[PDB]
Subunit: 90 residues, 3 copies
């Protein structure tokens, strides 16, 4: 019984984001080239996946947090985490 992680990165420094699902909560650790620090993302979930992409210099991150059969998409687009349009129907 171990925590479950997901990772993404962008750029050439690079920036790295590691999401950890632990006891029903997902938290975020961040690297921007200097050191690791705790990120703003903190949402419920037993399982996590992530993907990201750049548009110019702007990073866009999508975190897929799952509890039971419900997957919630969380969006970072430069100004805070927001709930995305993703639905599944599991």
């Amino acid at each position: 019984s171990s925590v479950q992680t997901a990772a993404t990165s962008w750029g050439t420094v690079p920036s790295i984001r590691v999401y950890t699902a632990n006891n029903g909560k997902i938290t975020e650790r961040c690297w921007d080239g200097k050191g690791w620090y705790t990120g703003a993302f903190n949402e419920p979930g037993d399982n996590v996946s992530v993907t990201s992409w750049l548009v110019g210099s702007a990073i866009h991150i999508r975190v897929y947090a799952s509890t039971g059969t419900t997957t919630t998409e969380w969006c970072w687009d430069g100004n805070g985490w927001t709930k995305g349009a993703y639905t599944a129907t599991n």
Copy 2:
């Protein structure tokens, strides 16, 4: 018990694919910039991971579906899912 997902994205719109393993079946949800829809991928698996890459305008997707100690690679290269040559000795 929660479902397990894997996500990938390409391009700048972007396109996103989210794979969900649920009770031994993997299904696929797709975003191409307008809304989410159900993808063609549907294969057995209790665990899924994914990676993708572009060569010019051509997208390639590799989905690794596992049941027990067996991992099957599924390939998208523009015209249907096929599977791949991947083998493991788990």
Copy 3:
């Protein structure tokens, strides 16, 4: 019930790396355009995630291996796997 995998890819060939967590061991399978082979990475873990990036033609890989609440980061930067600076407080 099943093994757990993580995948990454880079370049246009492409190179693919698939990490498998199985009974407390994470192992690595590699594709560089010709066939699959077993990689050098072999470390303890019940869960694995991965990310990678290019700096020019040089590939960098980060593998996040977790046991219990401890996540260890493993780094490939061209010349062997080394433990990274990642820490979490799970």
